[PDB]
Amino acid sequence: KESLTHASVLSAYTASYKTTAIKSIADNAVVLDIGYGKGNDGPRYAVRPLTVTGIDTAARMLAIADQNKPENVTLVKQGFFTHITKTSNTYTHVIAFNSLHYPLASSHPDTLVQRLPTCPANILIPCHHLLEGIQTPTYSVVKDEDMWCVKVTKNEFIESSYNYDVFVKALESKYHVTIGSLLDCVEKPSTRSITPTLWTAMRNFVNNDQEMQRILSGYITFNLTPLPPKVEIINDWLD
Ligand SMILES: Nc1ncnc2c1ncn2[C@@H]1O[C@H](CSCC[C@H](N)C(=O)O)[C@@H](O)[C@H]1O
Ligand code: NA
């Protein structure tokens, strides 16, 4: 133990994937961040040619996010389904980092996907069926009846189950999908507290810790590009 615990590596790798995704958003995009929360990705949006709408259901967290909100960011307090109905923005990129499993637990996965704007997207989602059993001093996922118990540091969150399989099958109806894991992250997070020496120390710990690789393998990433328009019947016409 020396600043190098399971929760520490997880947030750093999470920070790694957000750095790459936000950077890879096309220039001048109108972005929707579903679950903007307390504003961790503000500094990454602030240094970029992007118009961003951050939506959350928690006002207390959107209050922490306003205390240092970049001006290219607009904050709105409405969940995803209300906002998609009411908004006048046409979005060109969707971001959802550790957020979509909440709406997916109270909706049909095909309804969430068809309601998402038809635009490129990046999704980080925990797959609790790939995380159950992992018990480390700072990270633990355990089953509790129909609900999931997850402990980060000492935070004791309860999350509900969602249908990952149907979700992935619905994305395949709309998107070219490349699936991945946090374990596939190499790029150094933009977080300035993560020095080059510390990142190397984190990635070396991943190469030599089984528990860590399991935690990282259970945080599933989705790089989405919209399929061609239903006029894909022309290509099937080559059968
Ligand atoms: N249906 C919903 N619509 C929008 N935001 C939601 C939501 N359900 C939960 N959220 C928000 O999603 C967030 C996930 S945690 C914060 C995630 C943030 N993207 C980050 O990277 O730090 C929470 O703040 C939660 O309030
Ligand atoms: Na670019």
Domain definitions of the chain by residue range: 6-227
Report strand pairing: 155-160 vs 147-152.
antiparallel
Q: Cα(104)–Cα(112) distance, rounded to whole angstroms?
A: 7
Q: Which residue owns the Cα nearest ligand 1 atom 11?
A: 35
Residue 48 CA: which ligand is closest?
2
CB 99 less than 6 A from any atom of ligand 1 = yes
CB 21 less than 6 A from any atom of ligand 1 = no
- Closest-CA residue to 177 (of 104, 229, 121, 96): 121
Residue 49 CA: which ligand is closest?
2
Q: Cα(91)–Cα(29) distance, rounded to whole angstroms?
A: 8
Q: Residue 41 CA: which ligand 1 atom is closest?
A: 21
CA of 104 to the centre of ligand 1 (A): 12
Chain breaks in the chain (C to N over 2.5 A) after: none
6-227 CATH choice from 3.40.50.150, 3.40.50.1100, 3.40.50.2300, 3.40.630.30: 3.40.50.150
CA of 195 to the centre of ligand 2 (A): 25
The token duo for 114 is: 């068809």
In sequence order, the 6+-apart residues with CB closer than 8 A to the CB of 84 are 115, 116, 117
* CA-to-CA dists, residue 112 to 16, 87, 105, angstroms: 26, 16, 10
- Closest-CA residue to 22 (of 72, 80, 116, 93): 93
In sequence order, the 6+-apart residues with CB closer than 8 A to the CB of 19 are 44, 187, 188, 189, 190, 191
Q: Which residue owns the Cα nearest ligand 1 atom 14?
A: 99
Q: What is the 3-state secondary structure (H, E, C) of 57-111?
A: CCHHHHHHHHCCCCCCEEEECCCHHHHHHHCCCCCCEEEEECCCCCHHHCCCHHH
The token duo for 42 is: 């503000």
- Closest-CA residue to 40 (of 155, 223, 221, 191): 191
Beta bridge partners of 36: none
* Helices marked H in the chain: 6-24, 42-46, 59-66, 80-86, 109-115, 164-174, 196-207, 210-217, 233-236
Helix (H, G, I), strand (E, B) or coil at 149: strand
Beta bridge partners of 76: 55
Cβ burial 178-197 (10 Å sphere, 16+ → b, else e): eeebbbebeebbbbeebeee
Q: Cα(57)–Cα(219) distance, rounded to whole angstroms?
A: 22
Please, which experimental method was used?
Answer: X-ray
Beta bridge partners of 31: 52, 93
